Amino acid sequence: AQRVTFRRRNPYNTRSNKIKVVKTPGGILRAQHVKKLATRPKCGDCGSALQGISTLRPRQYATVSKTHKTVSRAYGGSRCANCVKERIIRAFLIEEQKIVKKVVKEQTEAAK
Amino acid sequence: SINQKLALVIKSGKYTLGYKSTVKSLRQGKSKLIIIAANTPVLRKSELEYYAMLSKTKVYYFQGGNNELGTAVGKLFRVGVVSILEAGDSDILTTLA
Amino acid sequence: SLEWDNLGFSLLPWIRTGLDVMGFETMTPVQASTIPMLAGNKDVVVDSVTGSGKTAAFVIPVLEKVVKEEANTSKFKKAHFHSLIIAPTRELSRQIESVVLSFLEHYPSDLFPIKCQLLVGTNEATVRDDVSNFLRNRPQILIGTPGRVLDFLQMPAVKTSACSMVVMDEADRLLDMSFIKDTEKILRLLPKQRRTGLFSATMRSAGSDIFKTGLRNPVRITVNSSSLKLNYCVVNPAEKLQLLVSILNNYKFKKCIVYFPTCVSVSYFYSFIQYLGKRNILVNEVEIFSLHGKLQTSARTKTLTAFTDSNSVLFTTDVAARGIDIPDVDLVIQLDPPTNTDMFMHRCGRTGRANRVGKAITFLNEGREEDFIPFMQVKNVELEELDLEVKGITANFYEDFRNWILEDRDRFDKGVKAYVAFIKYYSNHSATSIFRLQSLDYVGIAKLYGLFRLPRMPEITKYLNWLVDPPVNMDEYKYKDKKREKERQETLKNISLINDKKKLKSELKKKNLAWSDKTLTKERKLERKEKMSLKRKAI
Amino acid sequence: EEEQIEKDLQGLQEKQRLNVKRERRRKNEMKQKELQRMQMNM
Amino acid sequence: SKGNAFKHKRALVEHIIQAKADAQREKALNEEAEAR
Ligand SMILES: [Zn+2]
């Protein structure tokens, strides 16, 4: 039933300073400031959370290996699997349509 | 009509409803005709068109949405594409439809 | 026209050759109206009388579809099948398989063969043997009962994707409440786009349940035409077995089929009638067999083939009632009316083939017999009353049964078990008004089975002891079997220990009931008030 | 004795009639509901 | 049960068993009624 308060300069209940109450090895209750939770990286096309990539603070990514923040597939770590599949299919079909349109133009200009 | 032929095919013939089944049957070469609803997404429609060109399967563009095509087939759910494995008793294949 | 040559689709030459060698001299209306459509992209629902060519009517289109869809070729895959056939009993499925084999006898050589496999519950072949020889032999036709075919299809080694033909014989029985659980799974495994043929002599009864099978393009077919006699006797239950005897040694027949409600009753009464025949109670050239459906499959097959092969009496349950055809059967006796009336027409339907002179007899309990006859009349069945004298019983028959029971305690156990099983069977009876548990002659039925004490049942306690006035103690009753005699004596020596185990169980059940502490409190209050009034009123 | 038979036959017949009525009602309601739902997507 | 047809466990169990009994009886109910 012991009351605890902030341990830093800020006296206001702002998002920046949030308090948890913990029992120290001295048998007493004491406050502890909690950091902001990390946010999962999101896909750049659909905005869904990327799978297989660890969730860390922006500056904590500078200290981990590349396998913990990428995926072995192309666009891995930036776009998800379904978006890459759509990109591949769309690019191939667009190229095929360009070929067909070029053949049609060649035929229609071949009359004269 | 075209709805009567489709209903007869579902009653007596062999069919596959849906995009995945249609593509699988196109790969296996067992499709005689693919009816495509007008409500289908453009990417899937273009993929089906390319697959039909590869497999030399006749294409019929249904004049209605996936729900109208589902009702024409006789099912209370939407179907986006139908593939006719066997006409059976009907004559949809004979009349170039 | 009823000519094979002028049918729509010009049946295959080898099927025609098989038909001609078998004969039939023509095609029946069922085969004339079903074969053109069941092979023509239409599901089939066929109701027809017994022995009207129905089996060939659904076998010929099966072979036609098998040949048509290139099932008999090297292109056909392994672990796949084409057509399935389901029947409610093992003998019916084996008979269907025999018909298919007879048709395939004349199948030409120099081509990829067409084979069939029978999947029934047997003690001579596990399901893994069925899978092994299915993989090795590669058939295109499967024939079997729902349980073993369900077990077979559930095995991962069998693929059902190429099936295109399902046939259900006795489809009203396979869509029954008991069989619907298995057939739903069996049809769930198989592909939906297929051709279904339902065939049953009472297909109208399964009214709206036919669409549970998954018909796509169906056409219902009804075929209609004194062939046989339908009688009934209204007698006291305790005399019923005696009346049976008075029919067996007096009537004129080549084969008599006697139906019993339960399997234990079949065995028990078979043994007692054999004992009576040992004493020469009935003197005739009669050979008596028993055949119920709880036997091992090999024993059932052997008994059926011995009976089918000289004057014979069969004590059978409802396994033999439907489908199977034993020629030269003259007399059919239903010792009790069936649990469901729909099967009644089947039980007495084993006779009357080609308007043969055959008789069916039924027995009634004298209490609510006024309701069974009009019930059949509304269903367009007329039962002419028959009067039969109870010959040979003055006073001794029940005494003879009782003193034969006293020889072996196994006989006592079998009799009491059969009586209790019959009581449960009567509990599960349709047409509740006609067959009432309250109006049941419990003492009469117990007298019929030779028992000398009413088993403890809720029915006996509520709606209604020692039948023999000088009681007999069970302590001096000897089991007559050496292995179980010592077990009985050990249990007798442990009477108090088992009694105390049950007492502790009863107390623990008391303490675990709904709000038991409150119940004990209420009993305390009631007991105190009642025991106070028990003296305050007197003083 | 027979009063129970009369009562349960009458009760089961009334239950059957109510079941038929409610099945007809629900069938009409769901057919209209699915028609409207199918048409609302356009 | 989502529509508050059952108020506790025993009610649900009794409803299930009564439904089984009625699903056994309805087929013969009509002919029994016609018989009387
Ligand atoms: Zn994405």
Side-chain angles (χ1 to χ4, degrees), chain E residues 9-25:
Chain E
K9 214 183 101 173
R10 297 199 313 106
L12 178 50
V13 169
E14 291 168 3
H15 181 277
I16 291 175
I17 62 170
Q18 193 34 30
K20 284 163 201 183
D22 291 331
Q24 184 178 2
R25 204 151 191 300

Side-chain angles (χ1 to χ4, degrees), chain A residues 43-48 50 79-84:
Chain A
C43 174
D45 280 337
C46 60
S48 56
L50 287 175
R79 267 72 168 197
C80 62
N82 302 336
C83 286
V84 170

Side-chain angles (χ1 to χ4, degrees), chain C residues 12 14 62-72 114:
Chain C
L12 295 171
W14 62 275
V62 157
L63 301 170
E64 292 283 346
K65 293 283 297 299
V66 163
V67 181
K68 184 242 296 181
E69 303 291 343
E70 295 293 65
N72 59 322
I114 313 184

Side-chain angles (χ1 to χ4, degrees), chain C residues 199 203 262 264 282 299 313-314 340 345 415 417-418 437 439 451:
Chain C
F199 293 80
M203 199 65 259
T262 71
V264 53
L282 65 162
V313 189
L314 185 64
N340 72 316
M345 289 299 304
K417 192 164 308 169
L437 272 176
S439 300
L451 292 194

